[PDB]
Write a protein that binds this ligand. Structure first.
Ligand SMILES: CCCCCCCCCCCCCCCCCC(=O)OC[C@H](COP(=O)([O-])OCC(O)COP(=O)([O-])OC[C@@H](COC(=O)CCCCCCCCCCCCCCCCC)OC(=O)CCCCCCCCCCCCCCCCC)OC(=O)CCCCCCCCCCCCCCCCC
Ligand SMILES: CCCCCCCCCCCCCCCCCC(=O)OC[C@H](COP(=O)([O-])OCC(O)COP(=O)([O-])OC[C@@H](COC(=O)CCCCCCCCCCCCCCCCC)OC(=O)CCCCCCCCCCCCCCCCC)OC(=O)CCCCCCCCCCCCCCCCC
Ligand SMILES: CCCCCCCCCCCCCCCCCC(=O)OC[C@H](COP(=O)(O)OCCN)OC(=O)CCCCCCCCCCCCCCCCC
Ligand SMILES: CCCCCCCCCCCCCCCCCC(=O)OC[C@H](COP(=O)(O)OCCN)OC(=O)CCCCCCCCCCCCCCCCC
Ligand SMILES: CCCCCCCCCCCCCCCCCC(=O)OC[C@H](COP(=O)(O)OCCN)OC(=O)CCCCCCCCCCCCCCCCC
Ligand SMILES: CCCCCCCCCCCCCCCCCC(=O)OC[C@H](COP(=O)(O)OCCN)OC(=O)CCCCCCCCCCCCCCCCC
Ligand SMILES: CCCCCCCCCCCCCCCCCC(=O)OC[C@H](COP(=O)(O)OCCN)OC(=O)CCCCCCCCCCCCCCCCC
Ligand SMILES: CCCCCCCCCCCCCCCCCC(=O)OC[C@H](COP(=O)(O)OCCN)OC(=O)CCCCCCCCCCCCCCCCC
Ligand SMILES: CCCCCCCCCCCC(=O)OC[C@H](COP(=O)(O)OCC[N+](C)(C)C)OC(=O)CCCCCCCCCCC
Ligand SMILES: CCCCCCCCCCCC(=O)OC[C@H](COP(=O)(O)OCC[N+](C)(C)C)OC(=O)CCCCCCCCCCC
Ligand SMILES: CCCCCCCCCCCC(=O)OC[C@H](COP(=O)(O)OCC[N+](C)(C)C)OC(=O)CCCCCCCCCCC
Lengths: 506, 75, 491, 60, 192, 80
């Protein structure tokens, strides 16, 4: 469905005239395409049938119940992201017209979704290289979709160069394995898992670690996420991690067969450093997206501990954590896009310049959100408390399940370090909440008619005009209540994660 | 099963009621929104209950094999 | 029935207050009718909700059997088992009684946003009350840390000048230390596959593993009582938090650490607790002695009371780690007696003087008895309760705690008697100054204690003296529950 | 029961170089695009192939 | 797991479409009109421009109908495929499958059909297309070849089941059926 | 000489010189694939080599367009 509908959309977009409305309606067609893709995928793929692992296309691909869950998660999160470009985020044309000015925005997303979903399924070194290029190229094209933006193009140049170096590392690792064994299929290579050099697969993981922004390669991702438009940063900071981490889990599942503890130590070294950088890095920053970039680096370190331990408790930890972290990531960026409407307008020191791509760029632009919109401010507080790991929010069970798998495998040091890392990173998570609310009483009775929202007109002065659009408000309401009230269904959700198997069987 | 679907619809009422606070409108604005929201989460709730009922059936079948596997180990 | 009704009713109460007070946010710019008299109706609804929560625990108290061994009212709700014993029942009632007091103490001394404050108070009370009725380690940790989210925002919004410092201190000291307690809980769930109270109480772990688990848990407990040297968060948090936040912090939040010893250490790590008791006694004794001498040099009224709380909770820690019934009962009674006297002293010091003069420096106040005689009576009466004068529940708690320490360790447990002298040194140095000499030249004569502040002081004093004269109201309930915690094999 | 159920699900049986799961269902090389009979080094008889290792489905 | 009888591990494209139930055609129509209908619903939920409802232009409804038409067929194709695989209830399809195979066997014709492909290409085609429906949501791939790798043993068609006595098919031995592997390599073992 | 990262001095001081290094580095992987495939008499390795060449040429074009548009952004006044 994805491939077939992409071709029609590519041709149709080039046929009709260029207008903001037509691009917005074409984006809604992309929303329908992903929904049909999800319905078709659900209709044919079921957890019980895929438990064994089924080969497709001359064994080039291999789908199992662990791969299938991530594919559905990718489709669901991609549905939520397209609502941002398919509906009004703020309702004001000066801000929202950006999401409708590029007709190839939806085409690139559909190109990348194909790469995202196929990557966890790779069963051959030749197709591993091809797909990892397909995913990477679409990310570069999305990072440069706004080609009239100096920062957006500069990020895409940085993204291309770093991601090409990682791809060469990935290709160099597969060529070394082919040279050793003369084989290309993963299952054939598994027959010689005891005789090939296992560190040839660590080189393969190193290229994958660059593409997820792990330390010491964290610098480029922190730079790129801060320079890119908030709508672009929302996608590129989350989507590559859903697929690559799932692929890393499958590769580490094969690596654990031979039980090379030297390889386990190198990865533990990268996790340890990433916890230190992820926590201490965000303490002295003023940009919200730079802060979230370190948050992403920290949460990836938590998941990689579950991936490194790689046991029955690790499947449950990784599966639950990746689902709840994606929803928290989506919820936070949705609020950040919305709350640009409460920005004061001049009518000056430090000569602060704010652009249309990233109206919310500094943490202190979130000031007085507790006064402007209490329900949204609480929704942002709930999400930030979830990242902190305050029970009984979703983020608590994520850290709890990660710790179980890590401590069960003897990773005493990394379990202690992450809990120290969690405490250190709480300092900059709390600073968001301090900005939102702590000045409520000393500012409650003030006259603020200089906001961006005040520039909007009024219809009749007898109607009730909602200040936030319908779709974006319902998504924020739904995700926030899921994060808050996960205790009700936590037992049933974790029983489902018990059934997701990766060649466990018996 | 009505009691379970009753709670899911009440969750959908809460979702809509929370949304009204986000948009800063009175909670009585467009009362049809609660009916729409309630049914949308009853539908999700009904599918959720089928998912959990399936999971318990699958878990029992897997547990039987796991117990046989554990009995061999405990010797 | 208890947990299910206590949660469902309060959610309806939380939603009701939000619906009424937020129905008019939408550029109405109106004047409403619930916003009059500092949101009087919204305050009154929240005040009623707090009292009704006390009625719910009573309905389950009427059926409580003091001659039954084990948890009662065993319930399943949200896939969690909830139960009550003699120890838990009294701590739940203490927690819920302070709910109305916290709301009424801040009845008219907030700059605004009364609905938010009332919800957070009722939200803090229920989460703390639910922490005494959970029956597994993970549920204990969930409720142990869930209070940080509302408490952090309560301090930062309604706090004093240094509220930003105090909000960070409470969030980071308590969250970082509790994560070490989470490590021990994760270990229990890994090797035993359950965190249920009864299940883990029967398992004996290796003496080396019991040491690691004890240290993880004791780190979380020691910070939250607090004990030296991890006590530095409390004086800063108490001086900046609102009056209701200080009442709940000084009345309930600190008592969760003693209940943590009762659940998470004594019945499951019994062998290693005996090994650690000398270390616990040394830390607690020095916590008692150091905090008393440090309290002498303090110059802030609300910080003096904060350091007074640390001295008495060191005595509670000493009693609960005695391996006899006398010490355990003494520590529990002292927890309840402190749960009334300490909030009362914050009302006198940070709720009456501060609401009139807005300054907590000791140098501004003296001779208050000349124009505030009613304030001086309550100040003097609660000062003697705070030093463990007989006829007060504090003395009964202190005497049995000291006696339990002497029975447990005759040599070093005798140092606990310094609580009698040292507590009177700093408490009667402050009271002798507020009621001494000529009425201060830096103060203008104003109103004495009002009816609301008389009401708060009377209903915190009354339980202290009833327990002090007839503690068997409490000891009868605790007798069978406390006897299960003792570990000894006499031959 | 809850403690027992978690013990079964969370137990991870050991994997080494002697027992692990390989998802190959049939032997390759029955047909080649050209020159299927090469140096006659293909000693596998596809007329009398022994039964393969069928994967285990735990839900069946 | 509620498994059923395996009919064809890699059903041919024509067989899948022919074995559509009336509900499969119904879902094909629902997909076709579900895409324009969702464009109306999205506008109803939140208008694209301004605050008033506006019907989307006819050109959008034209491309939407085409997208739904392909989506409706892919859903119906996967619905019918599960019956061949045995994942879904297929009692009707087994009876129809048995009649067609027994009819072709009695005529000494291949149940699979004659192929333009040589033995390698028939095997290669089955390798490419078998189980490809699991990714039909991502990109399409169909079995449009007459290969013999269908995961079934034709000896099971030589036992008469309940409700098949009135068919009176006299089945020859498998070595007389044209275009089958067991009746192809007569003179040389590497040439059919 | 390799472990002290002598290759960092051989790369020129323009953004395009980084592009050339990437092409040369990837070309080293393909030469290694061709060498192994020829020794083994394996056409699967040569199919891999052909795929690498086509894919490596795709990213060369995608990276060039980014650098082309980056230079256009600087020369943006275009009053002519
Ligand atoms: C068929 C005619 C057609 O495609 O629609 C006319 C369509 C509109 O032409 P027009 O005169 O400019 O219409 C004015 C409006 O702009 C046109 O506005 P519009 O909205 O009416 O047309 C947009 C069109 C969207 O059209 C497409 O999506 C093209 C699909 C091809 C992929 O939406 C539809 O109407 C869908 C039904 C028509 C396309 C059905 C294609 C089925 C798949 C084959 O013309 C084309 O798109 C031609 C593209 C294909 C060229 C031939 C490619 C050759 C490939 C094989 C070569 C070897 C043989
Ligand atoms: C990201 C990139 C991802 C990749 C995306 C690219 C997508 C690629 C996937 C496309 C398909 C992949 C396979 C490509 C390789 C095909 C090479 C091949 O199969 O050659 C062998 C094949 C001949 O080998 P064979 O073993 O003798 O099989 C004979 C029939 O084809 C088979 O027997 P039969 O029962 O079908 O009899 C044929 C006759 C049957 O007509 C009758 O006599 C009536 C029998 C009942 C039919 C009624 C239902 C018909 C459904 C309407 O009429 C047909 O059914 C035509 C078959 C094609 C149907 C439409 C194809 C669906 C494409 C969508 O060459 C063909 O003619 C194939 C059919 C035409 C090619 C389809 C091209 C689709 C594009
Ligand atoms: C659209 C939402 C539809 C939800 C469908 C979730 C799903 O994919 O099915 C559950 C899936 C198991 O599916 P499976 O058993 O393999 O196949 C047959 C099941 N019918 O289990 C899974 O693996 C799903 C994994 C991803 C779960 C993500 C949860 C998303 C939470 C709801 C999204 C928020 C909704 C916001 C509403 C905005 C729209 C107005
Ligand atoms: C209208 C009909 C309401 C739905 C009826 C229903 O069945 O709800 C389910 C549950 C009732 O309980 P039941 O399932 O019968 O058995 C006890 C186990 N919870 O009732 C519930 O599950 C209500 C749960 C929602 C209220 C709790 C939400 C979380 C509160 C914060 C967590 C506090 C603890 C930390
Ligand atoms: C405001 C102040 C309030 C009060 C502050 C605290 C004051 C109390 C501190 C001292 C503790 C109480 C002293 C009780 C110890 C005396 C008990 C005793 O009977 O002495 C002897 C006893 C063992 O008895 P015995 O039979 O003689 O030994 C031979 C055994 N075959 O045991 C012995 O052999 C002697 C044990 C050593 C005693 C050390 C006493 C010094 C403690 C100094 C503490 C630091 C200063
Ligand atoms: C400033 C705050 C304002 C409050 C200040 C004053 C506080 C109130 C003072 C009283 C405190 C409450 C304690 C008394 C409550 C009643 C206790 C009780 O239940 O007594 C029971 C007693 C024995 O029980 P039993 O044999 O089982 O028969 C009863 C069966 N239900 O049966 C009896 O024989 C009852 C005997 C009761 C005697 C009267 C008690 C009143 C206090 C006077 C004695 C106090 C102790 C003496 C201290 C003098 C100074 C050293
Ligand atoms: C076959 C492809 C071409 C069929 C197009 C037929 C069609 O779309 O109906 C025409 C109709 C145009 O009507 P309208 O533009 O409003 O009136 C003229 C205004 N000057 O267009 C419409 O109003 C849209 C009505 C639905 C169009 C369905 C066409 C589906 C295209 C085929 C998909 C399957 C292949
Ligand atoms: C689609 C139409 C395919 C049906 C068709 O027209 O040709 C099919 C036909 C196979 O039938 P037959 O001639 O009996 O082959 C002998 C088998 N021994 O003979 C063929 O297979 C001819 C090949 C059909 C290819 C038609 C063009 C493909 C369309 C590309 C776009
Ligand atoms: C302004 C408002 C502030 C907050 C107010 C809070 C109101 C709470 C309303 C609760 C309604 C109710 O009672 O829901 C209850 C119903 C019915 O439960 P059941 O099917 O019998 O399951 C039995 C429940 N056990 C296990 C406790 C016995 O389940 C629900 O709907 C679940 C709520 C959804 C939570 C999100 C997680 C599930 C989605 C999974 C996606 C990954
Ligand atoms: C089978 C079960 C589902 C059935 C219903 C689902 C589709 C509802 C569409 C009706 C039309 C409509 O939405 O109309 C638009 C309305 C009103 O919008 P407003 O913001 O008041 O604008 C003001 C309108 N004036 C100006 C006319 C007054 O929006 C709603 O009511 C929003 C409710 C959406 C419910 C979404 C449920 C999602 C569940 C997700 C689970 C994973
Ligand atoms: C027992 C479990 C309960 C869970 C539900 C929590 C309450 C939900 C409130 C949403 C509605 C809302 O944001 O409403 C806002 C309300 C009331 O504010 P107000 O004074 O009317 O606003 C001002 C409007 N004026 C200007 C018109 C007067 O604030 C509350 O309620 C605050 C309670 C939450 C604080 C703690 C947050 C901790 C997050 C993590 C928790 C683990």
């Amino acid at each position: 469905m994805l491939f077939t509908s992409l071709l029609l959309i590519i041709v149709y977009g080039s046929l009709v005239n260029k207008s903001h409305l037509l691009t917005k309606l074409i984006n809604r067609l992309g929303l329908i395409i992903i929904i049909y893709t999800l319905l078709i995928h659900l209709n044919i793929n079921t957890l019980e049938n895929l438990s064994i692992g089924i080969n497709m296309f001359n064994n080039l691909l291999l789908i199992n119940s662990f791969n299938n869950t991530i594919i559905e998660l990718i489709l669901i999160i991609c549905i939520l992201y397209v609502l941002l470009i398919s509906f009004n985020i703020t309702g004001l044309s000066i801000i929202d017209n950006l999401n409708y000015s590029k007709r190839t925005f939806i085409v690139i997303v559909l190109f990348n979704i194909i790469g995202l979903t196929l990557l966890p399924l790779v069963n051959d070194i030749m197709i591993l290289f091809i797909i990892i290029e397909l995913q990477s190229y679409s990310l570069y094209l999305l990072t440069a979709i706004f080609n009239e933006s100096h920062n957006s193009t500069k990020s895409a140049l940085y993204y291309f160069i770093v991601g090409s170096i990682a791809s060469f590392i990935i290709l160099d690792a597969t060529v070394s394995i082919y040279d050793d064994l003369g084989l290309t299929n993963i299952q054939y290579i598994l027959m010689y898992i005891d005789k090939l050099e296992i560190f040839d697969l660590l080189c393969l993981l190193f290229g994958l670690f660059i593409k997820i922004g792990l330390a010491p390669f964290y610098s480029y991702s922190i730079t790129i996420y801060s320079l890119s438009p908030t709508i672009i940063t929302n996608y590129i900071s989350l989507m590559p991690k859903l697929s690559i981490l799932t692929l890393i889990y499958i590769i580490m599942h094969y690596i654990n067969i031979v039980n090379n503890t030297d390889l386990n130590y190198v990865i533990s070294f990268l996790i340890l450093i990433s916890m230190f950088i992820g926590s201490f890095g965000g303490l002295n920053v003023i940009r919200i997206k730079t802060l979230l970039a370190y948050s992403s680096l920290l949460n990836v370190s938590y998941m990689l501990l579950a991936i490194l331990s790689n046991s029955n408790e690790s499947i449950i930890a990784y599966i639950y954590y990746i689902i709840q972290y994606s929803l928290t990531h989506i919820n936070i960026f949705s609020i950040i896009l919305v709350i640009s409407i409460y920005l004061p307008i001049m009518n000056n020191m430090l000569n602060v310049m704010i652009t249309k791509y990233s109206p919310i760029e500094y943490i202190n632009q979130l000031k007085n959100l507790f006064i402007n919109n209490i329900f949204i401010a609480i929704a942002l507080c709930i999400s930030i408390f979830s990242l902190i790991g305050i029970p009984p929010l979703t983020g608590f069970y994520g850290k709890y399940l990660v710790l179980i798998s890590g401590l069960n495998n003897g990773y005493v040091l990394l379990s202690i370090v992450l809990i120290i890392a969690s405490s250190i990173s709480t300092v900059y998570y709390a600073t968001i909440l301090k900005v939102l609310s702590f000045d409520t009483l000393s500012f409650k009775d003030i006259i603020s008619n200089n906001l961006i929202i005040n520039t909007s007109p009024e219809n009749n002065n007898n109607e009730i005009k909602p200040e936030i659009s319908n779709v974006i408000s319902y998504v924020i309401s739904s995700l926030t209540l899921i994060i808050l009230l996960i205790i009700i269904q936590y037992e049933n959700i974790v029983k489902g994660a018990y059934l997701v198997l990766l060649y466990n069987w018996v | 099963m009505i009691a379970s679907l009753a709670g899911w619809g009440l969750f959908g009422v809460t979702v809509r009621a929370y949304q009204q606070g986000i948009r800063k409108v009175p909670f009585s604005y467009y009362p049809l929104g609660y009916v729409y929201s309630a049914l949308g989460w009853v539908a999700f709730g009904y599918g959720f209950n089928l998912w959990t009922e399936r999971n318990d059936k699958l878990l029992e079948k897997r547990v039987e094999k796991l117990k046989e596997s554990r009995n061999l180990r405990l010797s | 029935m208890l947990v299910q009704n206590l949660i469902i009713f309060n959610i309806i109460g939380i939603v009701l207050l939000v619906l009424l007070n937020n129905n008019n946010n939408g550029i109405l710019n109106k004047k409403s009718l619930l916003t009059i008299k500092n949101e009087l109706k919204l305050k009154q609804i929240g005040l009623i909700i707090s009292i009704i929560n006390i009625l719910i625990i009573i309905e389950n108290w009427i059926g409580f059997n003091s001659n039954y061994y084990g948890f009662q009212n065993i319930e399943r709700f949200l896939n969690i088992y909830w139960g009550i014993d003699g120890i838990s029942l009294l701590l739940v009632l203490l927690t819920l009684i302070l709910g109305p007091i916290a709301i009424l103490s801040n009845w008219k001394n907030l700059k605004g946003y009364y609905t938010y404050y009332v919800i957070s108070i009722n939200m803090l009370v229920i989460l703390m009350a639910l922490n005494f009725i959970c029956l597994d380690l993970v549920s204990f940790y969930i409720l142990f840390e869930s209070t940080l989210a509302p408490l952090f925002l309560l301090i930062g919004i309604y706090g004093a000048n240094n509220k930003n410092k105090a909000a960070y201190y409470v969030l980071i000291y308590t969250l970082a230390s509790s994560l070490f307690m989470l490590l021990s809980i994760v270990i229990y769930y890994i090797i035993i596959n359950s965190t249920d109270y009864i299940y883990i109480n029967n398992i004996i772990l290796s003496i080396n593993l019991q040491s690691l688990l004890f240290i993880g848990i004791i780190i979380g407990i020691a910070v939250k009582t607090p004990l030296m040297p991890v006590h530095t968060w409390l004086p800063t948090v108490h001086s900046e938090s609102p009056l209701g936040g200080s009442i709940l912090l000084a009345g309930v939040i600190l008592k969760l650490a003693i209940y943590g010893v009762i659940r998470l250490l004594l019945p499951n790590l019994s062998e290693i607790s005996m090994m650690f008791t000398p270390i616990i006694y040394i830390i607690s004794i020095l916590t008692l002695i150091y905090s008393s001498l440090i309290t002498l040099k303090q110059t802030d009224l609300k910080v003096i009371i904060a350091y007074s709380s640390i001295s008495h909770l060191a005595v509670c820690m000493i009693g609960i780690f005695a391996n006899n019934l006398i010490g355990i009962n003494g520590s529990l009674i002292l927890c309840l007696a402190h749960g009334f006297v300490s909030p009362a002293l914050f009302i006198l010091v940070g709720g009456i003087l501060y609401d009139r003069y807005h300054n907590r420096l000791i140098n501004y106040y003296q001779g208050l008895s000349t124009f505030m005689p009613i304030f001086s009576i309550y100040l003097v009466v609660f000062s003697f309760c705070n030093t463990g004068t007989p006829l007060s529940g504090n003395f009964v708690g202190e005497f049995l705690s000291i006696t339990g320490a002497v029975i447990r360790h005759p040599i070093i447990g005798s140092l606990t008697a310094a609580s009698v002298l040292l507590s009177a040194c700093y408490q009667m140095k402050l009271t002798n100054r507020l009621t001494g000499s000529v009425f201060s030249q830096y103060l203008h004569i104003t109103n004495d204690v009002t009816n609301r502040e008389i009401f708060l002081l009377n209903w915190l004093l009354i339980p202290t003296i009833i327990i002090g004269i007839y503690p068997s109201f409490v000891t009868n309930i605790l007798n069978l529950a406390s006897s299960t915690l003792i570990y000894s094999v006499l031959i | 029961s809850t403690a027992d159920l978690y013990g079964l699900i969370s137990f991870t049986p050991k994997r080494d170089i002697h027992h692990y799961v390989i998802r190959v269902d049939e032997v390759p090389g029955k047909h080649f695009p050209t020159n299927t009979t090469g140096n006659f080094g293909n000693t596998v008889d596809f007329e009398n192939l022994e039964p393969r290792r069928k994967p285990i489905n735990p839900y069946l | 797991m509620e498994t059923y009888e395996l009919i064809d591990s890699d059903p041919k494209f024509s067989r899948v479409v022919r074995y559509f139930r009336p509900s499969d055609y119904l879902t094909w129509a629902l997909g076709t009109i579900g895409a324009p209908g969702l464009m109306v619903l999205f506008e109803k939920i939140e208008p694209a421009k301004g605050n008033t409802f506006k019907m989307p232009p006819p050109s959008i409804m034209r491309i939407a109908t085409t997208i739904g038409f392909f989506g409706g067929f892919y859903y119906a194709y996967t619905s019918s495929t599960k019956r061949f695989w045995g994942y879904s209830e297929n009692a009707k399809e087994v009876a129809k499958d048995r009649y067609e195979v027994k009819k072709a066997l009695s005529e000494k014709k291949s149940p699979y059909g004659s192929s333009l492909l040589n033995p390698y290409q028939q095997d290669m085609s089955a390798r490419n297309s078998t189980n490809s429906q699991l990714l039909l949501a991502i990109f399409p791939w169909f079995n449009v070849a007459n290969h013999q790798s269908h995961g079934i043993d034709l000896r099971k068609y030589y036992e008469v089941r309940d409700g098949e006595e009135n068919w009176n098919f006299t089945l020859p031995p498998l070595d007389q059926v044209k275009d089958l592997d067991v009746a192809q390599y007569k003179e040389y073992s590497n040439y059919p | 000489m390799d472990l002290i990262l002598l290759m960092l001095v051989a790369v020129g001081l323009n953004i395009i010189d980084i592009y050339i290094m990437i092409e040369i580095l990837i070309m080293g992987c393909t030469v290694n694939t061709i060498y192994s495939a020829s020794l083994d008499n394996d056409m699967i390795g040569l199919i891999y080599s052909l795929i690498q060449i086509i894919i490596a040429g795709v990213e060369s074009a995608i990276g060039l367009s980014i650098l082309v548009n980056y230079n256009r952004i600087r020369n943006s006044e275009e009053i002519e």
